[PDB]
Design a protein around this ligand. Sequence first.
Ligand SMILES: CC(C)[C@H](NC(=O)[C@H](C)NC(=O)OCc1ccccc1)C(=O)N[C@@H](Cc1ccccc1)[C@@H](O)[C@H](O)[C@H](Cc1ccccc1)NC(=O)[C@@H](NC(=O)[C@H](C)NC(=O)OCc1ccccc1)C(C)C
Lengths: 99, 99
Amino acid sequence: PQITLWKRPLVTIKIGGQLKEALLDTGADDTVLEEMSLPGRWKPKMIGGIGGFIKVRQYDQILIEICGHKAIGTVLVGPTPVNIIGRNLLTQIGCTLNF
Amino acid sequence: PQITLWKRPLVTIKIGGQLKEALLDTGADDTVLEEMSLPGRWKPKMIGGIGGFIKVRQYDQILIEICGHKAIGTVLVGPTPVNIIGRNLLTQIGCTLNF
Ligand SMILES: CC(C)[C@H](NC(=O)[C@H](C)NC(=O)OCc1ccccc1)C(=O)N[C@@H](Cc1ccccc1)[C@@H](O)[C@H](O)[C@H](Cc1ccccc1)NC(=O)[C@@H](NC(=O)[C@H](C)NC(=O)OCc1ccccc1)C(C)C
């Protein structure tokens, strides 16, 4: 798809057998999802943004389907108000910005 | 340009006679710049992100050059660690996401 930016670029993701909406986010280094249960071990991690820093759980080698495109990557889980697809996964699906 | 996402999508902007680097950010509703002096009246505004909220100053009808492309828009100024070009201006320069 070619996605204009008049609205928030939300797409459908499938992760852990569940369907969610997520923002395609060129300003995010990492992928950060709201609280959900993922199978596996994890490491604590801190991420920063506007207004400060949150603690998240890091999971590696997680399968995600982003608009029908499969990617495997590190996914962070924690108290974010919106599901974020960051650059670690955007490069895997061949996502570019064009103007 | 076509911009891949292996690194942070930083571009040159010119604003108020000054040269800066700014992130092209599809996850930002608004454009948010580090502290600088802009001529004109302003309105207080709050914006939110990961880790909380911040107070910013809002300026309207500000001329910005993003990579040689001129746009006029609302620019927010406040304590952000990185200059953000958000969707209000990305639509004006015809910027799309593609995969
Ligand atoms: C998502 C995070 C992982 C991301 N942070 C990172 O990538 C950081 C650098 N990573 C990181 O921490 O790496 C490890 C590390 C460790 C030690 C030291 C340094 C780093 C981030 O917050 N990035 C933001 C920019 C930023 C980065 C660093 C520092 C400061 C700011 C936006 O690009 C990012 O796109 C977010 C994503 C997002 C969207 C929606 C909700 C929450 C988060 N958008 C935003 O924060 C934008 N807000 C919005 O667009 C909101 C949604 N609209 C809004 O506020 O409208 C008015 C409103 C008023 C009242 C109620 C509701 C709305 C903002 C830039 C304009």
